[PDB]
Amino acid sequence: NASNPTTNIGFDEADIFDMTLQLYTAGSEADIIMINPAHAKIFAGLQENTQGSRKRIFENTKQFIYEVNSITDPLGQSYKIIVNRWMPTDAVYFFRSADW
Amino acid sequence: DALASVDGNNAHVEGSRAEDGEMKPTVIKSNVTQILRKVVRVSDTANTTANYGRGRELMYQLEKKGKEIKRDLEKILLSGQARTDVLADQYLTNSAADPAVAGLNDTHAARKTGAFQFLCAHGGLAGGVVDKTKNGPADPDTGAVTVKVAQNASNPTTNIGFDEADIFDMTLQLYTAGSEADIIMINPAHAKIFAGLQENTQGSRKRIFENTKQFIYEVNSITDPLGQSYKIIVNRWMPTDAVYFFRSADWTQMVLRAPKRTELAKDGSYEKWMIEMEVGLRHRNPYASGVLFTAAGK
Amino acid sequence: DALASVDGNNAHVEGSRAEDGEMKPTVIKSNVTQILRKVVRVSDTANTTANYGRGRELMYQLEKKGKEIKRDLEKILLSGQARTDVLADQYLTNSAADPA
Amino acid sequence: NYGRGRELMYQLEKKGKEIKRDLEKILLSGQARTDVLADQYLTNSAADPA
Incomplete structure (x- = not known):
């Protein structure tokens, strides 16, 4: 959470792609x-x-339309988005259906 | 190797008086092939357990070794190996066949094949691997340096960051x-x-x-100012401090013996097995493909 | 399982003996289950007069609690809760030798 | 040979009898297990590298 100030609880702006890189490697x-x-x-x-x-x-x-429901990393991996109401605010999951 | 230079002026005075031509014939490049075994040694008491998912222990381990050797090949073909063999100038020498080898029958060295960074017009050898800190020589045909160390002119020559637009210069050299x-x-x-x-x-x-x-945050196509398209590809088996510009027909995988599974001798307390895959790399012209090493400005 | 690191120095010699190689075992993981229960008790003093709105309060509340347990199951699966048990790290000692 | 039959099958059956006798002796003498497992007999507990 570098870009934002120290007021927001926590989240990234360009480190969501480091995670995709880690998953790819x-x-x-x-x-x-x-x-x-x-x-x-x-x-x-x-x-x-x-x-x-x-x-x-x-x-x-x-x-x-201030909405986004699809992301693509520089490596080519598409990434759809889903909004789950019963999830905890302080977490974000990158997973697959069959893996679970 | 190359064609004959232009030599600039080409005036004439009604007579050549040459030196039997300035042909300067082609240069012969060669390459060697190595061996890849990836031995496996399992016990006999560990080949009868339940093995819930692994099932047949030896078969599973052999499949694992197959995947491992495939990955090792994909890594080595893009690594910085250096052609190393007992032959230096007697490569072909069919007639004599290096008389100074036979007689001992055990002086056999480790055959190391020439790698991409070596066949792509290197400019030295940093001990045992191609140098990643010096640009290659100039192509005699035209001024061309297919091996360049980047100059990160976007950082203050202190941060270790691959240059942003040093690729256009490499494309210029390739076009030349x-x-x-x-x-x-x-x-x-x-x-x-x-x-x-x-x-x-x-x-x-x-x-x-x-x-x-x-x-969408991605790039999969580039076009240099000269009009040459370039498709980008990602490979996790390359050295992070290197970039290669391939061409399908320019490179080929030479094979003498296909990957074969076999078993060595017996009369031990173990059931040994192994694989054997002999392979090498070839290149049409060193000055065709291009390499770019990453570093910071001096 | 996970494959081994890719080697980049395999320079084996011809006409030699096959030396033993390095092998790695298969890692194992474990977890525990969770039980969910509800109660839809009823007195039955109703259903003798002419019920007004819904009828079968039993089945109504039972379906309500079914939806509730589904909601709670989703919330539990998506929320972070450790592998809490009474074994207290004795997970790998099935049939605890201490009946205490 | 005449009574030996051969050198392989005769030796093999003789060694089979010998190992049977040795097995019976080792079983009836008395000796406790000594395999290094350290309470991991059950709970398969794959070889635990290192």
Whole structure:
């Protein structure tokens, strides 16, 4: 949680890909990410950064979508997202259905 | 090896008076093949237990050794091995066949094949492995250095970070040398740079999301200013401090003996088995493919 | 199980003897189960008059508690709880030698 | 041979009788188990590397 200030409880902004790198070098082939609704707006925040390197653009479109339900790492592994209500706010799981 | 240089001026005064031509014929490159065994030795009392999932202990261990030898081959073919054999200048020497070998019948050395970093126009030998701190020589055909040490001009020459855009210079050298390569292999610990290529700090590169439920952060295709496409590939079996630019036809896997499972002698308290796979690497032209070592500016 | 580290110095010689190699065993893991129960007791003093809304309060509350146990099962599976037992690390000593 | 029959089968059956006698002696003499398992007889407890 380097980018944000020391106020947020905890979560990353560019270290979610270090985990995908670790999984790839281990051998996992999972493409799923379960998250609680509380720590969900953070995922949508990935489409915009304070640094001048990521922004949104609306060409006179009456449809605001601050949502994200799919991620892709530089290695090529897709990653769908799911919002589980009964999960704990202070955790994020990257797993597969068959593994469990 | 190469063609004949241009020599610049080509004036003439109605007469050659040459020296029987300046042909400078081709140079002969050679390579050696090594052996890979991956022995296995199991006891006899440990070959009858329940073995819930492993089942047949020896068969399971043999499959494991097969996977291990395959991984070791995938690693060595991209490693920095150096051609090492008892023959130095008498490689072919069919007639004499190195008279100074036979007589002892036990002076056999360890056959080590030439690796990619060695066959790709090296520029020295750091003891036993190709040097990762000096650029190779120039191609006599045209000015070309297919082996370059990066210069991370984005960091203050203190951080160990692979340069961001030192690949365009390597592509320039490849184009000058006549490579036509179209592939770029990279270790997983460096795709972060290729992904950041889409962005920057000056503000001239930035992604956009017009009402999209996606955060695609990936690169799998590059195009240098010269018009040469390049497909990126990830391989976890390469040295992190190296990048190779392959080409399918330029490299081939030579095989003398296929991977064979067998068993050595007996009259012991053990049931030995083993595998044997003899293989080597070949290259059409050293100056065709390209290599890029990672380091920091001096 | 997990394969062994990939070697990069295999330079075996021709016409030699096969020296024994390195082997690794298969790791083992263990866990424990969990029991969930409910109660839908009823007095039966009802059902003699003309019930108004639902009827079969027993089955209604029973389905309610079924949904409840499903919810709790999901919550438990997704929430972090250690391998708590009364053996107190004696998991690998099945049939404890101390009946105390 | 004439009574020996051969050198392999005769020797093998003789050694079989000998090992049978030795087995009976070792079983009836009296000796406690000494295999190094340290209470891990049950609970298969794979060889535990190191």
